Amino acid sequence: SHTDIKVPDFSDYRRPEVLDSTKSSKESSEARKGFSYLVTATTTVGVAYAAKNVVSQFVSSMSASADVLAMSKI
Amino acid sequence: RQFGHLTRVRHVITYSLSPFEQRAFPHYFSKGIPNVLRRTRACILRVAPPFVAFYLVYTWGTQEFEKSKRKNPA
Amino acid sequence: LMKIVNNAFIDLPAPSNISSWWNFGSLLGICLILQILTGLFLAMHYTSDTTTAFSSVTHICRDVNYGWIIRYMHANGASMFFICLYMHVGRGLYYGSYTFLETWNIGVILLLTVMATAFMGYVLPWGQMSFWGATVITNLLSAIPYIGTNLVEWIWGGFSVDKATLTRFFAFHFILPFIIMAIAMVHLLFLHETGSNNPTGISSDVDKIPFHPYYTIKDILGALLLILALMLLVLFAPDLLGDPDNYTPANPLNTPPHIKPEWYFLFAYAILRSIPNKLGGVLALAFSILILALIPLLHTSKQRSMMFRPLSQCLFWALVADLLTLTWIGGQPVEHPYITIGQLASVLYFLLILVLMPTAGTIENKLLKW
Amino acid sequence: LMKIVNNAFIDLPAPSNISSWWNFGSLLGICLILQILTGLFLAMHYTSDTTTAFSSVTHICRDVNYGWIIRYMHANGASMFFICLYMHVGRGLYYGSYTFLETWNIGVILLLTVMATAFMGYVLPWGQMSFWGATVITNLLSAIPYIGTNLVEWIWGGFSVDKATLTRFFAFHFILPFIIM
Amino acid sequence: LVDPLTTVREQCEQLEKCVKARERLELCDERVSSRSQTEEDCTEELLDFLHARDHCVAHKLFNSL
Amino acid sequence: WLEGIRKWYYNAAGFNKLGLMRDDTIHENDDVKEAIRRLPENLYDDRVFRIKRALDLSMRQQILPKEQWTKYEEDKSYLEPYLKEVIRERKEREEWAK
Amino acid sequence: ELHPPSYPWSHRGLLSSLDHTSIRRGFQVYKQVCSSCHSMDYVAYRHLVGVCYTEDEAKALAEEVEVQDGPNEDGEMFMRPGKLSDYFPKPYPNPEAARAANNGALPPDLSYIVRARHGGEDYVFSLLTGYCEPPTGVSLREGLYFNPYFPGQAIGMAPPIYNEVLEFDDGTPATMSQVAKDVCTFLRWAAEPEHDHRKRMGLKMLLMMGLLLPLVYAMKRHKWSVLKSRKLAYRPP
Amino acid sequence: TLTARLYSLLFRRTSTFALTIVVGALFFERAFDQGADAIYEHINEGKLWKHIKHKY
Ligand code: HEC
Ligand code: HEM
Ligand code: HEM
């Protein structure tokens, strides 16, 4: 029935820091939530590095070309 | 269309876990690599032999073309 | 409240058995926007005059601050564009997208929109393959009797290619992506009433799932591979696909010994070049493309996919040999070891499609009794 | 079945006490498509170079078969365009369209899209009012302190109007109607 | 003064593929000169002597310079 | 000889490795949507769980172990009775209209 | 045809740059030799800045040559010493004069010739150093010459280069070879003034995309992990 | 651990989250260019301007 129901084991998949059912969470959760958002953040860093350079190319294309500066001061 | 009025389901159970409670890449090398090969052994025989002939027709296509520009004894 | 229509890209039902192939289904949205974005900034210094256009390209690659990249993010971007399509489209055959008749036809009109667009994009810089690349193809439309000379002269703006031919393309070429930009939404609209189509071919209504976390990032992962495979070429081998000759100025009074348009026509151009007759191959050309509209009347199997039709896989990957052959055979000249090929390869193309893929389902149904 | 969205232009509820003013509400759809249609065929012979653009206009008005009309269906079309708007917009005040806050703001962004568009459309033929018509207005953006000289030089493609100023508009000007579309 | 190239071409005419193509070139040379009327030439044997030559030169030439 | 091939080709399709049947892989048209709709719950629900898990494994590209695979002799024709019933009504629906 | 080999270079490597010292002597060649009949119109002295010469030094060459510029107030034109904005001196005013100065044949431009000819450099370096005696059974009009790398093996190319044809600044050997090195190095720069910078973004890309690609591939595998580990069952009566 | 102590300080609150990124990105920018250019110089030593920028 709905009580004979049982949950299998994910110990083949879980993190090592939680496999001991006798322990408790809240001692690694703060870390487990940190390592993954670190990937989210570190990802977000490099995308921003891409944006500053890739856009400035286009914007600096809108800028005065090299041909004009030759005629500017002289 | 959206969720709610698609179809019928009866007597089905779904178990699943947070991502945080499991490593992202467990058994990648350990279990993935055979599954790669198993995926390979089911497809190579119906994919390669065209490309096998292609490599040959790409070969003989040059050699005969290579000889034709080379002269004849006359 | 235009927030409810953008649920189709956020909260849309879609399957879960999905490969990495369907990254390609959305990269075009990234190719197209990027390509437009590139080309738009690019046309800030293009000029639509014969006497200066080729030079006006040189105005970019030399004197603009980091603009020289933009010639190649755009140009070789157009190659990565097509690399998606013939991985996007052969998909629909290997999985059975083409039953969605209201959508599959839309997937054609894009292709002829693009392959007639791109033809107007290689020609702008007056490369000495621009000119003849426009001459040969456009000359063929003289093949028709009693009107071929008219429409061709009518499009040439005279009796032959000239300045007047150029500007007429640059506007026709700067515009169609926007026409594609809206047709893109149409192509997704008829989808929206039915949704996607798994590799198995089974109606997966039971297992349709959200879209914002899962396939968004998955597509972004593909876009990364695209930008990678795009940034590689421009940085490491931009002269690879874009033929060398196109850096030559235009001159009608001299040809190269060898002619070939850009690589992607070549599966199709070879079909025509096979036929010694003039007109007898032209109708085969568009037929080779417009056969796609004609396939879905040839879904013989009451299955859908080809993951569960092993014999279809024997034919399907054999078709790729023919295309990838005609690709190479097209880009090579007219001599005896190669003419013998295209006289077969052209026939093989029409043959595999209209005889043997139908023949499969008529058999595979009989192999399993329905 | 994209036939259900085009009921908004076929089977849509709408009032019955309606004047002749609201003809103008849809003429823009006709002005815009016509104007685009005109200009598109028109740019088949425009040239984005200083040394030939003004002449390239003359290529039309003289040598093209009935193309000389197209300079004016388009150009003076743009005047009839604006004649609709300030009969389209003052309407909303005289009747009270402007309570539809989600719509009225959209009605602005068009206007600045157009009035900055059209500014790029009068300038193409190098009329001696094109140049100064672009100089004076654009010069004003130097009014800002510490950035005005930058953005203006940045848009001029140098230190003053030139060939580089032209092409940068012709693309910015050939495009926005589709953004409006 | 000297061309360093000749120093390198000289050594390579001794190697196998050059000597063999050289001998073939000589019979070609006499195949043509001996005959009176010939629409034939030793462009045939010349190029194979050279496609084999310059491959060795690739290996080491910019070591000097 | 024939019958060795139907068993053989049935193994090369692969859908016996994903716990599926012959009927489950059918293309869906209006003729079949009726038939599926006509199916009983004891069997209809048994369709979904066969399908539902094969999808989850197609996601992974995984399969089931050899024991769970489907045997040719157990490839029951549970759907054909309901199907041909329909087309017996289709062809009557049309020729009678002629 | 004839396929040139793949001669190595100081820049063939996918993070290799150009030896600017080699360029510095290469530019001497074009002015002393090739600028008599080759019309490089897509270049100016200013582009040499930051590459081989400086502002004032390269400007000394603009002072050297006269250039036709300026409508006089009389209504005529004149000659002045050029400047850094001025493109190179065109040898001849039009193509036809070049055909007239030769045996009916035209010199091509050399701005983008490298990227407009298969093999690029390796064609050119072996072209000059492919001169030899014609073979037996061949005949050529006057003005034409033999060179296997050119199509048809027949060309109106007078031999431009030879050992001790000129001298260079620092005093390196003026062999037929080293000169042939700097010149082909020079022309690649013509159709690529960005090589020094292409590799720079050529490198920045990898240590980003090589660094991101795992992370995004993890964030993928992060979210999907719910379904990479999802189990089911079937419990009707 | 460092991972956990990092979480409670910065990656917890969203308004704090974007602060770390642009800051670290700024400090990251100053390093990445210096890393690449020196290596690009390390490879092509004796070829660039700055290695002939003293003779003239
Ligand atoms: C005496 C005038 C003159 C000099 C000096 C000269 N060239 Fe040539 N060059 C010509 C002419 C004339 C042609 C025409 C070749 C033809 O018509 O096939 C030509 C052809 C060429 C080509 C065309 C090759 C191709 O694939 O089409 C190149 C490249 C070239 N020269 C480079 C050079 C180089 C390198 C040098 C110095 C080593 C040089 N030129 C010096 C007159 C000259
Ligand atoms: C599917 C859409 C398009 C295709 C297939 C296409 C095709 C091409 C190709 C292959 C080139 C290469 C020319 C070269 O490398 O020298 C090119 C150049 C060019 N494209 Fe397009 N293009 C497309 C869209 C656009 C767009 C959207 C714009 C502007 C917004 C544009 C403007 C230009 C211009 C001005 C050039 C000249 C640059 C050059 O020739 O190098 N194109 N086009
Ligand atoms: C700019 C051009 C295009 C855009 C923006 C576009 C967009 C899309 C997108 C986002 C999808 C969903 C992704 C997926 O199904 O994997 C899709 C699917 C599809 N596309 Fe494209 N597409 C384009 C070109 C084409 C072309 C040339 C064809 C030619 C046949 C085509 C045929 C299809 C079909 C049949 C589907 C259905 C997918 C399925 O059956 O599961 N599309 N398209």
Ligand code: HEM
């Ligand atoms: C709201 C949209 C637009 C406005 C306000 C506008 C404004 C103008 C105006 C007033 C002229 C008159 C120039 C003259 O009479 O000499 C003009 C010329 C021109 N328009 Fe635009 N235009 C618009 C859209 C377009 C479009 C859609 C195109 C192309 C599809 C286009 C291309 C041109 C060209 C090439 C010219 C030069 C012809 C000339 O100056 O006579 N414009 N524009």
